[PDB]
Design a protein around this ligand. Sequence first.
Ligand SMILES: COc1cc(Nc2nc(N[C@@H]3CCCC[C@@H]3N)cnc2C(N)=O)cc(OC)c1
Length: 271
Amino acid sequence: KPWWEDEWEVPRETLKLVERLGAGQFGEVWMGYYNGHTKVAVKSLKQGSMSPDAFLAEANLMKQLQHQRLVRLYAVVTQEPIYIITEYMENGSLVDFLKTPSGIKLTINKLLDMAAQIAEGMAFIEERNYIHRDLRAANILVSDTLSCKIADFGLARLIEDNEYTAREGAKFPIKWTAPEAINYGTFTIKSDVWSFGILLTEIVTHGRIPYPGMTNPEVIQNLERGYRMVRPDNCPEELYQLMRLCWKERPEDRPTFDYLRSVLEDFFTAT
Ligand SMILES: COc1cc(Nc2nc(N[C@@H]3CCCC[C@@H]3N)cnc2C(N)=O)cc(OC)c1
């Protein structure tokens, strides 16, 4: 729909940007208010840094992926500087939250609760025939009620035929990305499952970097030998064995997100 018919378009005047939360090569992210009263996150595109069509692609995707467990598109402003406005998440990124005094005090019960919320959002993505491709604790956001939502849909894609193949100069975070995606550029929902196992290590270590004391070449080398990440300190063995299922060698042998959600809810209620 053109901007004058798009239900998501709002006049820029409806927005007041209050506090800058981040800034990077491609723009800034602010906390602001819509129509005086409603707190929102506003992402602005730095003109020239990247295509406006490329920037807005993220918003268009979020229009197709609406669920309680996913950060919700609020609005767009499609005149320069282009804004994407989203649901504000008061405790920020999970990777950051788990290091704060509140995050530090969480019991394993609550960490298992949050893991299940994340699996629940990923089960919706899976059911809709999407993949995320950037699943990691930096891209989970936390609410003021300590519930978690999936965020950052820039790499997210509709799957037509089970798999998306990236450019052959395309580069991904080695520690979080499935071998088949690093090696062949081939991504499926089973690649997100691998990433989810790595995300579980970040939850249990309160946001530590995966594969402690290893470089990327060393991670690749160990994986090809058949090793997986060493048991993190204070990780319940049940949770470690669930991670190992996510890291099965064949993508098709890895579990579904619906299964993962089910198991983690059982771990939670039993703790
Ligand atoms: C200081 O970082 C905070 C961020 C947010 N919130 C958000 N940050 C988003 N990106 C940031 C970019 C730079 C890196 C941090 C974030 N990922 C994206 N979206 C939201 C959102 N929908 O709320 C809330 C906060 O309150 C405690 C602190």
